[PDB]
């Protein structure tokens, strides 16, 4: 899993976020 | 980097969280 901005990608899908560097990110999988 | 529960292990350092099943997590480098 991974945190990435702005969307999963690559056939990943979002489970979740993060917060980091005062931006949201989305928690991939 | 990595979520985890509930803490950064040896040696990493919190720089935010993620939420993911209902609990919030450290986001740990």
Same mark, same amino acid.
């Given at each position: /899993?991974? /945190?990435?901005?702005? @969307? /999963?990608?690559? *056939?990943?899908?979002?489970?979740?976020?993060?917060?980091?560097? *005062?931006?949201?990110? @989305?928690?991939?999988?």
């Amino acid at each position: /899993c991974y /945190c990435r901005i702005p @969307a /999963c990608i690559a *056939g990943e899908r979002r489970y979740x976020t993060c917060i980091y560097q *005062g931006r949201l990110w @989305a928690f991939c999988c």
